[PDB]
Coordinates of all heavy atoms in Angstrom, one line a residue:
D1 N -28.7 -98.0 -24.0 CA -29.1 -98.9 -25.1 C -29.7 -98.0 -26.2 O -30.5 -97.2 -25.9 CB -30.0 -100.0 -24.6 CG -30.1 -101.1 -25.6 OD1 -30.0 -100.9 -26.8 OD2 -30.3 -102.3 -25.1
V2 N -29.4 -98.3 -27.4 CA -29.9 -97.5 -28.5 C -31.4 -97.9 -28.8 O -32.2 -97.0 -29.1 CB -29.1 -97.7 -29.8 CG1 -27.7 -97.1 -29.6 CG2 -29.0 -99.2 -30.2
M3 N -31.7 -99.1 -28.6 CA -33.0 -99.6 -28.9 C -33.9 -99.5 -27.7 O -33.9 -100.4 -26.9 CB -33.0 -101.0 -29.5 CG -34.2 -101.5 -30.1 SD -33.9 -102.6 -31.5 CE -32.7 -101.6 -32.4
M4 N -34.7 -98.5 -27.6 CA -35.7 -98.3 -26.5 C -37.0 -97.8 -27.0 O -37.0 -96.8 -27.8 CB -35.1 -97.4 -25.5 CG -34.1 -98.1 -24.5 SD -33.7 -97.0 -23.0 CE -33.4 -95.5 -23.9
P5 N -38.1 -98.4 -26.7 CA -39.4 -97.9 -27.1 C -39.6 -96.4 -26.6 O -39.2 -96.1 -25.5 CB -40.4 -98.9 -26.5 CG -39.7 -99.4 -25.3 CD -38.2 -99.5 -25.6
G6 N -40.4 -95.6 -27.4 CA -40.7 -94.3 -27.0 C -39.5 -93.4 -27.4 O -39.5 -92.9 -28.5
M7 N -38.7 -93.1 -26.5 CA -37.4 -92.3 -26.7 C -36.3 -93.3 -27.0 O -35.9 -94.1 -26.1 CB -37.1 -91.4 -25.5 CG -36.1 -90.4 -25.7 SD -36.0 -89.2 -24.3 CE -37.8 -88.8 -24.1
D8 N -35.7 -93.2 -28.2 CA -34.6 -94.1 -28.5 C -33.3 -93.5 -27.9 O -33.2 -92.3 -27.5 CB -34.4 -94.1 -30.1 CG -34.5 -92.7 -30.7 OD1 -35.5 -92.0 -30.5 OD2 -33.4 -92.4 -31.4
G9 N -32.3 -94.4 -27.8 CA -31.1 -94.1 -27.2 C -30.4 -92.9 -27.8 O -29.7 -92.1 -27.2
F10 N -30.6 -92.8 -29.2 CA -30.0 -91.6 -29.9 C -30.6 -90.3 -29.4 O -29.8 -89.3 -29.1 CB -30.1 -91.8 -31.4 CG -29.6 -93.1 -31.9 CD1 -30.5 -94.1 -32.3 CD2 -28.3 -93.3 -32.0 CE1 -30.0 -95.3 -32.8 CE2 -27.8 -94.5 -32.5 CZ -28.6 -95.5 -32.9
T11 N -31.9 -90.3 -29.2 CA -32.6 -89.1 -28.7 C -32.1 -88.8 -27.3 O -31.8 -87.6 -27.0 CB -34.1 -89.2 -28.7 OG1 -34.5 -89.5 -30.0 CG2 -34.7 -88.0 -28.2
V12 N -31.9 -89.8 -26.4 CA -31.4 -89.5 -25.1 C -30.0 -88.9 -25.1 O -29.7 -88.0 -24.4 CB -31.5 -90.8 -24.2 CG1 -31.2 -90.5 -22.8 CG2 -32.9 -91.4 -24.3
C13 N -29.2 -89.5 -26.0 CA -27.8 -89.0 -26.2 C -27.8 -87.5 -26.6 O -27.1 -86.7 -26.0 CB -27.1 -89.9 -27.2 SG -25.3 -89.4 -27.4
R14 N -28.7 -87.2 -27.6 CA -28.7 -85.9 -28.1 C -29.2 -84.9 -26.9 O -28.6 -83.8 -26.8 CB -29.7 -85.7 -29.2 CG -29.3 -86.6 -30.5 CD -30.1 -86.2 -31.7 NE -29.5 -85.0 -32.3 CZ -28.5 -85.2 -33.3 NH1 -28.1 -86.3 -33.8 NH2 -28.0 -84.0 -33.8
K15 N -30.2 -85.3 -26.2 CA -30.7 -84.5 -25.1 C -29.6 -84.3 -24.0 O -29.5 -83.2 -23.4 CB -31.9 -85.0 -24.5 CG -33.1 -85.0 -25.5 CD -34.3 -85.7 -25.0 CE -35.5 -84.9 -25.1 NZ -35.5 -84.1 -26.4
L16 N -28.9 -85.3 -23.7 CA -27.8 -85.2 -22.7 C -26.7 -84.2 -23.2 O -26.2 -83.5 -22.4 CB -27.2 -86.6 -22.4 CG -28.0 -87.6 -21.6 CD1 -27.4 -89.0 -21.6 CD2 -28.1 -87.1 -20.2
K17 N -26.5 -84.2 -24.5 CA -25.4 -83.3 -25.0 C -26.0 -81.9 -25.3 O -25.2 -81.0 -25.5 CB -24.8 -83.9 -26.3 CG -24.1 -85.2 -26.2 CD -23.1 -85.1 -25.0 CE -22.5 -86.5 -24.7 NZ -22.1 -86.5 -23.3
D18 N -27.3 -81.7 -25.1 CA -27.9 -80.4 -25.2 C -27.9 -79.7 -23.8 O -27.7 -78.5 -23.7 CB -29.3 -80.4 -25.7 CG -29.9 -79.1 -25.9 OD1 -29.1 -78.1 -26.2 OD2 -31.1 -79.0 -25.8
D19 N -28.1 -80.5 -22.7 CA -28.1 -80.0 -21.4 C -26.6 -79.6 -21.0 O -25.8 -80.5 -21.0 CB -28.6 -81.0 -20.4 CG -29.0 -80.4 -19.0 OD1 -28.2 -79.5 -18.6 OD2 -29.9 -80.9 -18.4
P20 N -26.4 -78.4 -20.7 CA -24.9 -78.0 -20.4 C -24.5 -78.6 -19.0 O -23.3 -78.6 -18.7 CB -25.0 -76.5 -20.3 CG -26.4 -76.2 -19.9 CD -27.2 -77.2 -20.6
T21 N -25.4 -79.3 -18.2 CA -25.0 -79.9 -17.0 C -24.7 -81.3 -17.2 O -24.1 -81.9 -16.3 CB -26.2 -79.8 -16.0 OG1 -27.2 -80.6 -16.3 CG2 -26.6 -78.3 -15.9
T22 N -25.0 -82.0 -18.3 CA -24.7 -83.4 -18.5 C -23.9 -83.6 -19.8 O -23.5 -84.8 -20.1 CB -26.0 -84.2 -18.7 OG1 -26.8 -83.6 -19.8 CG2 -26.9 -84.1 -17.4
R23 N -23.5 -82.5 -20.4 CA -22.7 -82.7 -21.7 C -21.4 -83.3 -21.5 O -20.9 -84.1 -22.3 CB -22.6 -81.3 -22.4 CG -21.9 -81.3 -23.7 CD -22.0 -80.0 -24.4 NE -23.3 -79.4 -24.5 CZ -23.6 -78.3 -24.0 NH1 -22.8 -77.5 -23.3 NH2 -24.9 -77.8 -24.2
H24 N -20.8 -83.1 -20.3 CA -19.4 -83.6 -20.1 C -19.4 -85.1 -19.8 O -18.3 -85.7 -20.1 CB -18.8 -82.8 -18.8 CG -19.7 -82.9 -17.6 ND1 -19.3 -83.7 -16.5 CD2 -20.9 -82.3 -17.3 CE1 -20.3 -83.6 -15.6 NE2 -21.3 -82.8 -16.1
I25 N -20.5 -85.7 -19.3 CA -20.5 -87.1 -19.0 C -20.3 -88.0 -20.2 O -21.1 -87.8 -21.2 CB -21.8 -87.4 -18.3 CG1 -22.1 -86.4 -17.1 CG2 -21.8 -88.8 -17.7 CD1 -23.5 -86.4 -16.6
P26 N -19.4 -88.8 -20.2 CA -19.2 -89.8 -21.4 C -20.4 -90.7 -21.4 O -20.9 -91.3 -20.4 CB -18.0 -90.6 -21.0 CG -17.2 -89.7 -20.1 CD -18.2 -89.0 -19.3
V27 N -20.9 -90.9 -22.7 CA -22.1 -91.9 -23.0 C -21.6 -93.0 -23.8 O -21.0 -92.8 -24.9 CB -23.2 -91.1 -23.6 CG1 -24.3 -92.0 -24.0 CG2 -23.7 -90.0 -22.7
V28 N -21.9 -94.2 -23.4 CA -21.6 -95.4 -24.2 C -22.9 -96.0 -24.7 O -23.8 -96.2 -23.9 CB -20.8 -96.5 -23.3 CG1 -20.5 -97.7 -24.2 CG2 -19.6 -95.9 -22.6
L29 N -23.0 -96.1 -26.0 CA -24.2 -96.6 -26.7 C -24.1 -98.1 -26.9 O -23.2 -98.6 -27.6 CB -24.5 -95.8 -27.9 CG -25.1 -94.5 -27.8 CD1 -25.5 -93.9 -29.1 CD2 -26.3 -94.5 -26.9
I30 N -25.0 -98.9 -26.3 CA -25.0 -100.3 -26.5 C -25.8 -100.7 -27.7 O -27.0 -100.4 -27.7 CB -25.6 -101.0 -25.2 CG1 -25.1 -100.3 -24.0 CG2 -25.2 -102.4 -25.2 CD1 -23.7 -100.5 -23.6
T31 N -25.2 -101.2 -28.7 CA -25.8 -101.6 -30.0 C -25.9 -103.1 -30.2 O -25.5 -103.9 -29.3 CB -25.0 -101.0 -31.2 OG1 -23.7 -101.7 -31.3 CG2 -24.7 -99.5 -30.9
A32 N -26.4 -103.5 -31.3 CA -26.5 -104.9 -31.7 C -25.4 -105.3 -32.7 O -24.6 -104.4 -33.1 CB -27.9 -105.2 -32.2
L33 N -25.4 -106.5 -33.1 CA -24.4 -107.0 -34.0 C -24.4 -106.2 -35.3 O -23.4 -105.7 -35.8 CB -24.6 -108.5 -34.4
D34 N -25.6 -106.0 -35.9 CA -25.8 -105.2 -37.0 C -25.9 -103.7 -36.6 O -27.0 -103.2 -36.2 CB -27.0 -105.6 -37.9 CG -28.2 -105.8 -36.9 OD1 -28.1 -106.6 -36.0 OD2 -29.3 -105.2 -37.2
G35 N -24.8 -103.0 -36.4 CA -24.8 -101.7 -35.9 C -24.1 -100.6 -36.6 O -23.9 -99.5 -36.1
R36 N -23.7 -100.8 -37.9 CA -23.0 -99.7 -38.7 C -23.9 -98.5 -38.7 O -23.4 -97.4 -38.4 CB -22.7 -100.2 -40.1
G37 N -25.1 -98.6 -39.1 CA -26.0 -97.4 -39.0 C -26.2 -96.9 -37.6 O -26.2 -95.7 -37.4
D38 N -26.4 -97.9 -36.7 CA -26.5 -97.5 -35.3 C -25.3 -96.7 -34.8 O -25.4 -95.6 -34.2 CB -26.7 -98.7 -34.4 CG -28.0 -99.4 -34.6 OD1 -28.9 -98.9 -35.3 OD2 -28.2 -100.5 -34.0
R39 N -24.1 -97.2 -35.1 CA -22.9 -96.5 -34.7 C -22.7 -95.2 -35.4 O -22.3 -94.1 -34.8 CB -21.7 -97.4 -35.0 CG -21.5 -98.5 -34.0 CD -20.2 -99.3 -34.1 NE -20.4 -100.7 -33.8 CZ -20.7 -101.6 -34.7 NH1 -20.6 -101.4 -36.0 NH2 -21.0 -102.8 -34.2
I40 N -23.0 -95.0 -36.7 CA -22.9 -93.8 -37.4 C -23.8 -92.7 -36.7 O -23.5 -91.6 -36.4 CB -23.2 -93.8 -38.9 CG1 -22.1 -94.6 -39.6 CG2 -23.3 -92.5 -39.5 CD1 -22.5 -95.3 -40.9
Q41 N -25.1 -93.2 -36.5 CA -26.1 -92.3 -35.9 C -25.7 -91.9 -34.4 O -25.9 -90.8 -34.0 CB -27.4 -92.8 -35.9 CG -28.6 -91.8 -35.7 CD -29.9 -92.4 -35.7 OE1 -30.1 -93.6 -36.2 NE2 -30.9 -91.7 -35.2
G42 N -25.1 -92.9 -33.7 CA -24.6 -92.6 -32.4 C -23.5 -91.6 -32.3 O -23.5 -90.7 -31.4
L43 N -22.6 -91.7 -33.3 CA -21.5 -90.7 -33.4 C -22.1 -89.3 -33.7 O -21.7 -88.3 -33.1 CB -20.5 -91.1 -34.4 CG -19.4 -92.1 -34.0 CD1 -18.4 -92.2 -35.1 CD2 -18.9 -91.7 -32.7
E44 N -23.1 -89.3 -34.6 CA -23.7 -88.0 -34.9 C -24.5 -87.5 -33.7 O -24.7 -86.3 -33.5 CB -24.7 -88.2 -36.1 CG -23.9 -88.6 -37.3 CD -24.9 -89.0 -38.5 OE1 -26.1 -89.0 -38.2 OE2 -24.4 -89.3 -39.6
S45 N -25.0 -88.4 -32.8 CA -25.7 -87.9 -31.6 C -24.8 -87.5 -30.5 O -25.3 -86.8 -29.5 CB -26.6 -89.1 -31.1 OG -27.4 -89.6 -32.1

């Protein structure tokens, strides 16, 4: 989920893609109805 207190989902995604042991794992980001910005940032993450 993108909306998480403390560490947001985008940060978790970025960290997973930085670890060479978890980079391969597909990540699905759960957004809300209003998610164009969420989706753009998720793609960048």
Side-chain angles (χ1 to χ4, degrees), residues 1-32 34-35 37-45:
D1 197 327
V2 296
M3 191 143 313
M4 273 193 319
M7 194 168 310
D8 49 305
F10 306 108
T11 302
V12 188
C13 185
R14 301 195 81 91
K15 293 174 128 40
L16 286 166
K17 294 313 167 205
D18 185 28
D19 196 325
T21 72
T22 60
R23 188 173 302 123
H24 57 109
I25 310 166
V27 175
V28 183
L29 282 187
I30 322 289
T31 71
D34 47 306
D38 293 352
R39 287 187 211 92
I40 292 156
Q41 198 181 345
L43 277 190
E44 302 170 354
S45 311

